[PDB]
């Protein structure tokens, strides 16, 4: 149940599990989330901007315990330490990529812990 | 010019302006029957010191400030700026 | 006198004999839960949520529809009432799907602010959940009819205020539905105003659909200016962008309703907007430049001009602070010759105590009228909520309405009395009946529209209608004070414009060839370069580029109406100031400060700097404009009705046809209505 | 499915540094002037 | 006013107190300018002292001036000793700040009326 | 009623209804309101004329020891026509009892401080000066604790906004670390959270 | 205008897109009235929701489910 | 005692920097977010100050800003102490008015008529 | 957890099935609880002292004033009495006996 790097998950063959229900935003204590949504032309709503202020992020992890469709996951990898302040502000196209550098690391920890919570 | 326009102010109560409320009964129907060119103005309520304005000469204000007149004092004060 | 002390939870209060238990318990500062009830609607009872246990009775009654007898003990909190408010709001929370991640009323639904406070803790159902299908009605009402807890609230609104008989109830028992049986679209005036009434998130807005949740907005109250009756709105920002509006529910006008046009006209507000000063370049070329290029360009031209060579027009939607800095500039140079866009005939009066120029009856005094006669206008497709007050005051008592000229589709039982201008002359005599009833009424009401008055016989019908109007006033008049003759408008910045002392109707610019003009008209194309002399410059000052910015010399960016602390005048003379919610984009500035900034680069400099100092100047001309939201009792037109008798211009011969079409004229109206892609999206859906 | 080949790195400039940017739309859509003739 | 004062009674125990510590500042301005090892001219310091006292001269009520006396005296506690390490004394002078325009034509080219 | 509801008791609700009653009986000079909390707490509302002697009466007795000064706090309340609210909290050592002293005041009106009565108020009393400006009387050393040296705000009241005005920055223009007007990278988006429909029946206001 | 901040920084960008990846799914069919969608597995994924499939043989991906569902 | 009764309108200053004379406050009633019908959020006067510019922060598009106050709402009790707080610190303001609606006359049973017009159908 | 679920969130296997679970889940994170008014106070044994919290409640999801008392206010103002008459090398040996931690003197 160790916390760490943020990442986003998706369904079997890619679906963007996020539904942009904004609940992770309203419980972030540092307001590191900022989301602008829009009806995509297919009809189902998705995201346009998606931000995690990894500077401001105080790691209360409540985003992991607030999503109903279980989208955002604190991925257990402490690999970090870049060289600018201008880099750690994660946009969306880090996070889906960062959520897809691995999934079997993530998908086994949820599946061993979801019975408790 | 002189002049451009004049602005009548009054009040619906505080009965010092009853001379003006009489003046419309006396000289508004005949006062504008003569000179059908000058666009004189009437507004609603100053509620204290119902002044009477005049404005002309590259936009210069001229305010005669009636407080509480009689029915002829409002009739004679108007022709001072009107003839000039 | 005429009361019963009823001990609401053992505490006395005196109501009228014949009110409701709901209004009794709401008077002492309590809320019983409300689903099948609305104050601005009729009363049904088919949700059965208000259930109070009355004392000295084993049964439970509902507070919606029953009177109150001799003084009871309305036991609000009991050990049985909470066995009822838990009871009913366990059933209807079962046959319902698991939305609200995605339900767009997700921060204000009444299954979500009742269900924490009242009601149970868990569920025991435990499978079921019927699922009906949805459809589409118009391109405005996003439609999920699954949720639809059948509170019969949208259904009665078709028989209520909006008189379109379109909806119904299709089905029996568990399976009934709400939507129209056939695929007939539903769109008229007020047709987008149902999505406030639907108490759950089954109905919502189509353009707003998937944007943002309602706990992030900043509610700042303001006023809309797209009609002459004003509005009572509330905007909501996100990051300095406008999201949506809702009606602010003022009790005189905008009761719980709002104009259907103004609801979705905000789209073009941020669509096609000019942001920056664009230089002349000598051909039809027009490119941007420094803000301190085109100021000194026109500053030397001002001192070269003198006399009637320079003029201006203004008939759009601008405030009453930039219509004084213009006036204190062009009359400090002492060269007035200035007018508006709208065609209002002036023969005897209008500028001088104005005597009829506002809507004389209050909107609150409309319901006390008994016989209404109106000519020469379409009340449905200009001032839409005006017909809503007629519709409601046609109901709930007797009200008699006749009409002269061009039968259009009004909702209620009107009748075409006739169509000629000679009808207006013959009603001073005794002919074409009702004949006496306008005199033999107790609160008569005679309304003139500005669309027929725009014609060339305007000064003729101005004295023809007021002939029989004072004839009723010299009769009794009513009892009574009861001002009868009144008039309407359809441009917001006209009554505010004229009572500053402007002349109405384009005649002074229609006679001379002036050199430089100021455009605040501006899209109303009654003045072109065709009626102008040769290629001397005309300066545009505004916010959009529909008509008059291509035909221009130097354009000026400016804030529209949602960016400045403005001040407007309704059709009765109130002042309902708008306030700043979003600061304007580009290099545009506030439209009175630019004139003082243009004054200081010119010779003459105006003696007021801040917006308070503007209002000190606004005190000088007219003192009713700082009198907020009051209509004083002042008519004084015994004399002014006699003075228009000096003019005896005769009528014309033409059927009194309004510009308003079946529906289509309602959409493309002002400036933003043309620029809004939303109105263009729906107007192609009507002609199809 | 949608997973990478081998791995990557969290390096400072490889030359690549991910250089995070803005991902929205222009809102006001400023007006276009008409063309060169009058 | 049903309220007891702090030190003064009416305006005459007051106005002799604002004159009083003015001399304590006046011998302090040459004393600290070689102490905190900063380099301006010393007369600028004496101008800024009387700058501060003269600006608040629009008071016609006691115990507010007396409230500023407690504020004015507490300034000297850090000042006579060394409790402001070469920054807080420099904080009095808006030195590297860009100038405010304060002119109507100058405000109009830059800013949405700040 | 059930499990998972706090079991209240009546013994401590009895004696604390008993003990504090004859406190107002024996000093009807300063006491203006006494109330018993529904969970064994006591408030003794005192006009601040008797700021010293009532404490001095609770300083020593044979039926009330109360020599453990725990908590001096300060609570502002706008819309009261006398804003602030100094609230003590003291402890009886021999008796295991808590009682608070609520004394209102205003801004400019001083308060006779508790310096001879208690010597634990040495750093607590100065804090209200630094944060509000409530000038206590006759304190031997009034100074500046827990704030920076150049503030003029007394920040813990309500008109002081969330950030100050004093966002600090460095430049190499000469050596200095200079002040500047405040500039944020983000609004601190302020929400709107108060749901309607009045979840509480007991605290219902007088309906006017 | 903004194109100068990444010179020698190579613009690390995403490769796949879920803008349109629903459309490559074998759109399901049942021939019934109302179906559960606990897709992705039980107790994970999107919550249970019931859809009427009578009208142009489809459901509409349930919003939540995302997978094209029909008959 | 040293009571020394005197009179002055209490205008306090020195605690802010310059925004006394610059801004103008506003006292009004929040009135019924009309997506629903809960009337608990009446009965309390609030305040809000002037709104100034919100630009774009050219790295993300965040709503970074100047205008240092911009978020200050207090909870007042009534109209009486509404004015008395704006004058006690002393900057300019402007006051709205509380709107309470009609009582009003609503009665079921008159929705079934013999000759009247108040008659519902299709229920 | 506490079972009545106006305070505790419901379980994860519950907030994906029933209707009653989400409305008492989705609302419980937008706003918080519903706390009654009336002042309160308590303290417990911190391992270096008492721990005063005078939590003023107002009646909404957002609390009013929350003043804390931590040790070190008493435990270090009384360094004046404790120190004098002694050396300078004594003074550093004094401080590590009271066990004073900063950031905790922020009360
Ligand atoms: S984790 Fe939840 S709240 Fe956050 S973006 Fe995804 S669906 Fe929305
Ligand atoms: S990780 Fe922590 S700081 Fe970031 S959104 Fe989640 S709870 Fe907030
Ligand atoms: S739209 Fe839905 S909630 Fe509204 S009345 Fe119809 S069924 Fe009821
Ligand atoms: S409308 Fe009501 S029941 Fe439907 S999703 Fe929203 S809160 Fe839930
Ligand atoms: S509330 Fe409408 S019937 Fe009970
Ligand atoms: Zn599914």
- Look up the CATH number of the domain holding residue A94: 3.30.70.3270
H/E element, E88: none
Q: To the nearest whole angstrom, how far is the Cα of E113 from the nearest Cα of chain C?
A: 9
**Rounded Cα–Cα distance for residues C251 and C232 (Å):** 10
Q: Hey, which residues does C75 pair with through a beta bridge?
A: C53
Contact C487, C562 (CB under 8 A): no
Q: Which ligand is nearest to the CA of G36?
A: 6
Could you tell me which chains touch chain D, where touching means 3 or more CB pairs under 8 A?
A: A, C, G, H
Instruction: List the domain boundaries for chain E.
Output: 1-114
Q: Is residue A50 classed as helix, strand or coil in its secondary structure? A: strand
Cα four-point dihedral sign C597, C272, C205, C408: positive
**Rounded Cα–Cα distance for residues C577 and D5 (Å):** 63
CA C296-C301-C302 angle, 5° bins: 95
Q: Which residues of G touch A96 (CB under 8 A)?
A: 14
- Cite the annotated binding site of C by residue number: 36, 47, 50, 64, 96, 100, 103, 109, 148, 151, 154, 198
Instruction: Tell me which residue of C60, C66, C61 sits closest to C23, measured CA to CA.
Output: C66
Please report, for the domain that includes residue B45, its CATH number: 3.40.30.10
Instruction: Give distance in angstroms: CA of A60 to centre of ligand 1.
Output: 15
H/E element, C519: strand C516-520
Instruction: Give distance in angstroms: CA of G69 to centre of ligand 6.
Output: 8
Instruction: Tell me which residue of E106, E1, E108 sits closest to E62, measured CA to CA.
Output: E1
Q: Hey, which residues does A75 pair with through a beta bridge?
A: A5
Contact F191 C28 (CB under 8 A): no
Question: Does the annotation flag A3 for ligand binding?
Answer: no
- Can you tell me which residue has the tokens 């903004």? G2
The answer to whether D38 contacts chain G (CB < 8 Å) is no
Instruction: Give distance in angstroms: CA of G64 to centre of ligand 6.
Output: 7
Taking each continuous run of H as one helix and of E as one strand, the counts in chain B are: 3, 4
Q: Within 13 Å and on the Cβ side, how many CA atoms surround I79?
A: 17
In the sheet that holds C242-247, the strands lie side by side as C219-222, C233-237, C242-247
**Rounded Cα–Cα distance for residues E48 and E33 (Å):** 13
The domain tally of chain B equals: 1
**Rounded Cα–Cα distance for residues C25 and C6 (Å):** 10
- Inter-axis angle of helices C294-304 and C593-601, to 10 degrees? 70
**Rounded Cα–Cα distance for residues C598 and C298 (Å):** 9
Q: Which of I23, I25, I30 to mutate to test the pocket of ligand 4 (most atoms within 8 A of CB)?
A: I23
Q: Which ligand is nearest to the CA of C144?
A: 3
Contact D28 C275 (CB under 8 A): yes
**Rounded Cα–Cα distance for residues I91 and I74 (Å):** 17
Structure tokens that stand for G3 in this block: 């194109």
**Rounded Cα–Cα distance for residues I38 and I57 (Å):** 6
Q: Is residue A89 classed as helix, strand or coil in its secondary structure? A: strand
Structure tokens that stand for E2 in this block: 């049903």
Q: Which residues of C touch E113 (CB under 8 A)?
A: 590, 593
Q: Hey, which residues does A72 pair with through a beta bridge?
A: A8
Q: Which residues of C touch F190 (CB under 8 A)?
A: 218
- Can you tell me which residue has the tokens 């037109």? C637
Q: Resolution of the deposited coordinates, in angstroms?
A: 4.2
Question: Does the annotation flag A57 for ligand binding?
Answer: yes
The domain tally of chain A equals: 1
CA H116-H118-H121 angle, 5° bins: 115
Residue in H39, H68, H84 closest to F182 by CB: H68
CA B13-B16-B19 angle, 5° bins: 100
Structure tokens that stand for H106 in this block: 């609503």
**Rounded Cα–Cα distance for residues C471 and F87 (Å):** 76
DSSP H53: -
Contact H66, H57 (CB under 8 A): no
Instruction: Tell me which residue of F70, F73, F105, F77 sits closest to F87, measured CA to CA.
Output: F73
The residue range of the domain holding A15 is 5-116
Phi, psi (5° rounding) for residue D23? -135, 55
Q: Within 13 Å and on the Cβ side, how many CA atoms surround B70?
A: 3
In the sheet that holds C400-404, the strands lie side by side as C400-404, C371-375, C444-448, C485-487
Those residues with Cβ within 8 angstroms of residue E20's Cβ, 6 or more apart along the chain or in another chain: none
Q: Hey, which residues does F35 pair with through a beta bridge?
A: F43
Cα four-point dihedral sign E3, E9, E11, E16: negative
Structure tokens that stand for C557 in this block: 């960016």
Instruction: Give distance in angstroms: CA of G22 to centre of ligand 6.
Output: 13
Instruction: Tell me which residue of C449, C380, C399 sits closest to C164, measured CA to CA.
Output: C380
Instruction: Tell me which residue of C357, C350, C394 sits closest to C372, measured CA to CA.
Output: C394
Interface-testing mutation among A6, A55, A87, with chain D (most D C-beta atoms within 10 A): A87
Contact H40 C219 (CB under 8 A): no
Contact C546, C570 (CB under 8 A): no
**Rounded Cα–Cα distance for residues C557 and C288 (Å):** 11
Those residues with Cβ within 8 angstroms of residue F40's Cβ, 6 or more apart along the chain or in another chain: F9, F12, F13, F16, F98
**Rounded Cα–Cα distance for residues B7 and B57 (Å):** 16
Residues with CB under 6 A from ligand 2: A 24, 28-30, 32-33, 57-63
Structure tokens that stand for C350 in this block: 């209008």
Those residues with Cβ within 8 angstroms of residue F62's Cβ, 6 or more apart along the chain or in another chain: none
Buried b (16+ CB within 10 A) or exposed e, H72-85: eeeebeeeebbeeb
Cα C358 to the chain's mean position, in Å?
16
CA-nearest residue for atom 8, ligand 2, is: A28
The CA–CA distances, whole Å, from E90 to C433, C499, F39 equal 91, 58, 54
**Rounded Cα–Cα distance for residues B68 and C623 (Å):** 19
Q: Which ligand is nearest to the CA of A24?
A: 1
Phi, psi (5° rounding) for residue B20? -70, -40
* Cα dihedral H14→H15→H21→H26 (10° resolution): -150
Contact I54 F71 (CB under 8 A): yes
Residue C163 neighbours by CB distance under 10 Å: 20
State whether the beta carbon of C144 lies less than 6 angstroms from ligand 3.
no
Those residues with Cβ within 8 angstroms of residue E36's Cβ, 6 or more apart along the chain or in another chain: E84, E86, E89
Instruction: Tell me which residue of F196, E14, E61, F83 sits closest to I61, measured CA to CA.
Output: F196
**Rounded Cα–Cα distance for residues C237 and C245 (Å):** 10
Interface-testing mutation among F187, F192, F204, with chain H (most H C-beta atoms within 10 A): F187
Q: Which residues of C touch B25 (CB under 8 A)?
A: 639
**Rounded Cα–Cα distance for residues E59 and E63 (Å):** 10
Q: Is residue H24 classed as helix, strand or coil in its secondary structure? A: strand
Structure tokens that stand for A11 in this block: 């369904």
Pair type for strands B52-56 and B5-8: antiparallel
Instruction: Tell me which residue of C572, C259, C251 sits closest to C387, measured CA to CA.
Output: C259
Q: Is residue C518 classed as helix, strand or coil in its secondary structure? A: strand
Structure tokens that stand for C119 in this block: 């009601």
Instruction: Tell me which residue of H25, H31, H28, H70 sits closest to H45, measured CA to CA.
Output: H28
| Atom of ligand 3 lying closest to residue C154 CA | 5
Q: Within 13 Å and on the Cβ side, how many CA atoms surround F47?
A: 8
H/E element, I67: strand I66-69
Q: To the nearest whole angstrom, how far is the Cα of A104 from the nearest Cα of chain G?
A: 15
Instruction: Give distance in angstroms: CA of G65 to centre of ligand 1.
Output: 15
**Rounded Cα–Cα distance for residues G64 and H60 (Å):** 29
Contact A21 C209 (CB under 8 A): no
Instruction: Tell me which residue of B13, H37, E89, B1 sits closest to C196, measured CA to CA.
Output: H37
Contact C657, C406 (CB under 8 A): yes
Those residues with Cβ within 8 angstroms of residue C298's Cβ, 6 or more apart along the chain or in another chain: C516, C537, C539, C554, C598
**Rounded Cα–Cα distance for residues H5 and F38 (Å):** 42
Residue C461 neighbours by CB distance under 10 Å: 23
Judging by beta carbons within 10 Å of its beta carbon (0-12, 13-18, 19+), is residue C622 exposed, middle or buried? buried
Instruction: Tell me which residue of H70, D31, H24, E110 sits closest to C589, measured CA to CA.
Output: E110
The CA–CA distances, whole Å, from A53 to A6, A32, A48, B29 equal 11, 5, 16, 75
Q: Which residues of B touch C333 (CB under 8 A)?
A: 58
Structure tokens that stand for C523 in this block: 């899209």
Contact C91, C49 (CB under 8 A): no
Instruction: Tell me which residue of C270, C207, C275 sits closest to C240, measured CA to CA.
Output: C270
Residues with CB under 6 A from ligand 4: C 96, 99-100, 103, 105-106, 109, 111-112, 147, 200-201
Instruction: Tell me which residue of C600, C520, C489, C509 sits closest to C324, measured CA to CA.
Output: C520
Instruction: Tell me which residue of C4, C1, C2 sits closest to C13, measured CA to CA.
Output: C4
**Rounded Cα–Cα distance for residues A25 and A29 (Å):** 9
The answer to whether H63 contacts chain A (CB < 8 Å) is no
Q: Which residues of A touch G41 (CB under 8 A)?
A: none
State whether the beta carbon of C369 lies less than 6 angstroms from ligand 3.
no
């Amino acid at each position: 149940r160790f916390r760490g790097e943020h990442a986003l998950r998706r369904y079997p063959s890619g679906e963007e599990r996020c539904i942009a229900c904004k609940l992770c935003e309203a419980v972030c204590p540092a307001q590191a989330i900022t989301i602008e949504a829009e009806p995509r032309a297919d009809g189902s709503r998705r995201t346009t901007r998606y931000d995690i202020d990894m500077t401001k992020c105080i790691y209360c992890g409540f985003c992991q315990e607030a999503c109903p469709v279980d989208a955002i996951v604190e991925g257990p990898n402490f690999e970090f330490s870049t060289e600018t302040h201008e880099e750690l502000l994660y946009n969306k196209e880090k996070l889906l990529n960062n959520g897809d550098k691995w999934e079997a690391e993530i998908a086994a920890n949820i599946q061993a812990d979801y019975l408790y919570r | 010019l002189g002049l451009r326009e004049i602005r009548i102010h009054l009040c619906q109560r505080s009965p010092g302006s009853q001379g003006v409320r009489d003046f419309i009964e006396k000289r508004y129907v005949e006062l504008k029957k003569a000179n059908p060119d000058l666009p004189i103005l009437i507004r609603e309520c100053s509620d204290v010191q119902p002044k009477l304005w005049a404005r002309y000469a590259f936009g210069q204000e001229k305010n005669v400030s009636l407080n509480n007149f009689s029915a002829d004092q409002v009739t004679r004060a108007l022709e001072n700026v009107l003839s000039s | 006198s005429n009361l019963i002390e009823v001990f609401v939870d053992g505490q006395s209060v005196m109501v009228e004999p014949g009110t409701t238990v709901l209004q009794a318990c709401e008077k002492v500062g309590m809320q019983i839960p409300r689903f099948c009830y609305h104050e601005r609607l009729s009363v049904a009872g088919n949700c059965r949520m208000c259930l109070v246990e009355i004392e000295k009775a084993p049964k439970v009654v509902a507070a919606c529809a029953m009177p109150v007898m001799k003084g009871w003990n309305i036991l609000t909190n009991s050990e049985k009432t909470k066995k009822a408010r838990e009871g009913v709001m366990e059933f209807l929370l079962a046959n319902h799907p698991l939305d609200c991640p995605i339900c767009d009323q997700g921060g204000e639904c009444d299954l979500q602010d009742q269900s924490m406070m009242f009601g149970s803790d868990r569920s025991r159902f435990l499978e079921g959940k019927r699922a009906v299908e949805d459809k589409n009605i118009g391109p405005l009402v996003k439609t999920i009819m699954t949720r639809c807890i059948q509170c019969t609230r949208c259904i009665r609104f078709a028989s209520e205020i909006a008189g379109v008989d379109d909806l119904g109830t299709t089905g029996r028992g568990n399976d009934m539905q709400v939507g129209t049986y056939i695929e007939k679209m539903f769109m008229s005036e007020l047709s987008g105003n149902i999505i406030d009434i639907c108490p759950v998130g089954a109905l919502t807005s189509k353009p707003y659909a998937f944007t943002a949740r309602p706990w992030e907005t900043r509610k700042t109250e303001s006023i809309d200016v797209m009609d002459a009756v004003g509005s009572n709105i509330v905007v909501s920002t996100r990051t300095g962008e406008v999201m949506r509006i809702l009606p602010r529910m003022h009790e005189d006008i905008n009761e719980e309703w709002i104009s259907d046009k103004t609801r979705f006209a905000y789209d073009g507000l941020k669509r096609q907007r000019l942001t920056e000063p664009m230089v002349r370049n000598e051909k039809g070329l027009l490119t941007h430049t420094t803000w301190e290029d085109a100021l000194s360009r026109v500053a030397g031209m001002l001192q070269s001009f003198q006399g009637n060579d320079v003029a201006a027009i203004a008939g759009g939607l601008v405030d009453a602070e930039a219509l004084i800095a213009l006036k204190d500039l062009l009359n400090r140079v002492d060269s007035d010759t200035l007018c508006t866009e709208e065609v209002f005939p002036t023969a005897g009066a209008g500028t001088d105590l104005r005597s009829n120029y506002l809507l004389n009856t209050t909107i609150a005094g409309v319901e006390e009228a008994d016989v209404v006669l109106l000519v020469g206008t379409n009340p449905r497709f200009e001032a839409p909520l005006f017909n809503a007050r007629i519709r409601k005051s046609w109901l709930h008592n007797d009200l008699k309405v006749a009409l002269i000229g061009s039968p259009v589709d009004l909702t209620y039982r009107y009748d075409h009395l006739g169509d000629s201008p000679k009808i207006l002359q013959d009603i001073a005599s005794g002919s074409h009946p009702f004949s006496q009833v306008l005199q033999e009424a107790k609160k008569p009401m005679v309304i003139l529209g500005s669309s027929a008055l725009q014609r060339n016989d305007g000064a003729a019908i101005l004295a023809a209608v007021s002939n029989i109007a004072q004839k009723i006033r010299t009769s009794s008049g009513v009892t009574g004070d009861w001002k009868v003759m009144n008039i309407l408008h359809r441009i917001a910045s006209q009554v505010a414009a004229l009572d500053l002392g402007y002349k109405p109707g384009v005649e002074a610019i229609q006679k001379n060839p002036p050199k430089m003009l100021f455009l605040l008209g501006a899209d109303g194309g009654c003045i072109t370069r065709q009626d102008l002399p040769k290629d001397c410059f005309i300066v545009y000052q505004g916010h959009h580029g529909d008509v008059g910015a291509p035909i221009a010399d130097v354009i000026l960016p400016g804030a529209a109406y949602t960016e400045k602390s403005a001040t407007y005048v309704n059709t009765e003379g109130r002042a309902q100031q708008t306030k700043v919610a979003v600061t304007p984009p580009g290099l545009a500035r506030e439209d009175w400060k630019i004139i003082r900034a243009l004054s200081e680069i010119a010779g003459m400099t105006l003696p007021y700097d801040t917006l308070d100092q503007v209002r000190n100047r606004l005190e000088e001309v007219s003192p009713n404009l700082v009198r907020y939201d009051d209509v004083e009792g002042a008519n004084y037109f015994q004399q002014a009705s006699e003075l228009s008798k000096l003019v005896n211009q005769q009528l014309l011969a033409d059927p009194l046809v309004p510009p308003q079409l079946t529906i289509k004229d309602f959409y493309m109206t002002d400036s933003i209505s043309r620029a809004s892609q939303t109105m263009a999206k729906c107007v192609k859906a009507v002609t199809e | 499915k949608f997973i990478w080949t081998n791995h990557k790195f969290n390096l400072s400039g490889t030359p690549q540094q991910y250089v995070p940017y803005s991902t929205t739309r222009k809102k006001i859509q400023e007006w276009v002037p008409p063309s060169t003739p009058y | 006013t049903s309220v007891k004062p702090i030190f003064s009674r009416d305006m005459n125990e007051a106005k002799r107190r604002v004159r009083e510590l003015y001399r304590a500042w006046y011998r302090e301005v040459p004393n600290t300018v070689h102490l905190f090892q900063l380099d301006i001219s010393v007369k600028q310091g004496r101008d800024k002292v009387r700058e501060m006292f003269k600006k608040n001269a629009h008071i016609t009520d006691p115990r507010v001036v007396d409230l500023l006396v407690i504020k004015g005296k507490m300034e000297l506690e850090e000042t006579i000793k060394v409790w402001k390490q070469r920054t807080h004394v420099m904080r009095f002078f808006h030195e590297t700040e860009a100038p405010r325009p304060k002119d109507f034509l100058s405000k109009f080219y830059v800013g949405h009326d700040p | 009623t059930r499990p998972t509801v706090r079991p209240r008791n009546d013994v401590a609700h009895k004696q604390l209804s008993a003990f504090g009653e004859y406190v107002a009986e024996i000093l009807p000079k300063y006491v203006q309101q006494v109330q018993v909390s529904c969970f064994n707490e006591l408030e003794i509302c005192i006009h601040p004329d008797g700021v010293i002697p009532v404490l001095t009466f609770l300083r020593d007795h044979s039926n009330a020891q109360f020599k453990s000064l725990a908590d001096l706090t300060a609570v502002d309340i706008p819309t009261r026509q006398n804003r602030f609210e100094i609230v003590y909290n003291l402890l009886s050592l021999r008796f295991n009892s808590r009682i608070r002293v609520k004394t209102y005041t205003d801004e400019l009106t001083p308060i006779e401080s508790s310096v001879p009565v208690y010597k634990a108020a040495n750093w607590y009393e100065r804090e209200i000066w630094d944060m509000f400006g409530v000038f206590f009387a006759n304190h031997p050393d009034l100074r500046r604790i827990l704030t920076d040296y150049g503030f003029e705000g007394h920040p813990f009241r309500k008109d002081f906004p969330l950030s100050g005005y004093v966002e600090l920055r460095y430049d190499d223009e000469v050596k200095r670390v200079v002040a500047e007007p405040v500039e944020l990278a983000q609004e601190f988006r302020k929400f709107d959270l108060n749901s309607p429909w009045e979840a509480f029946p007991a605290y219902r206001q007088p309906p006017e | 205008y903004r194109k100068v901040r990444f010179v020698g920084r190579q613009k690390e960008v995403n490769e796949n897109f879920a803008i349109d990846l629903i459309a490559e799914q074998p759109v399901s069919q049942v021939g019934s009235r109302v179906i559960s969608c606990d897709g992705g597995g039980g107790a994970l994924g999107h919550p249970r929701v019931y859809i009427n499939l009578d009208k142009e043989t489809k459901t509409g991906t349930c919003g939540y489910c995302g997978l094209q569902f029909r008959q | 005692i040293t009571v020394d009764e005197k009179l002055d309108i209490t205008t306090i200053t020195g605690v802010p920097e310059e925004h006394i004379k610059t801004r103008k406050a506003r006292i009004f009633v929040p009135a019924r977010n009309n997506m629903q019908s809960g009337v608990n959020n009446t009965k309390k006067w609030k305040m809000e100050f002037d709104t100034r510019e919100r630009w774009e922060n050219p790295l993300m598009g965040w709503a970074s800003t100047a205008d240092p106050l911009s978020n200050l709402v207090l909870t007042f009790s009534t109209k009486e102490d509404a004015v008395a707080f704006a004058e006690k610190n002393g900057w300019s303001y402007d006051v709205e008015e509380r709107k309470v609606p009609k009582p009003k006359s609503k009665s079921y049973g008159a929705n079934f008529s013999w000759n009247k017009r108040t008659r519902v159908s299709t229920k | 957890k506490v079972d009545d679920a106006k305070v505790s969130p419901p379980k994860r296997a519950e907030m994906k099935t029933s209707m009653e679970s989400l409305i008492h889940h989705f609302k419980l994170y937008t706003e918080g609880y519903q706390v009654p008014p009336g002042a309160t106070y308590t303290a417990i044994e911190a391992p270096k002292g008492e721990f005063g919290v005078y939590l003023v409640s107002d009646g909404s999801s957002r609390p009013y004033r929350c003043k804390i008392k931590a040790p070190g206010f008493a435990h270090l103002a009384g360094l004046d009495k404790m120190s004098k008459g002694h050396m300078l090398a004594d003074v550093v040996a004094i401080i590590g006996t009271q066990d004073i931690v900063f950031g905790e003197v922020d009360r």
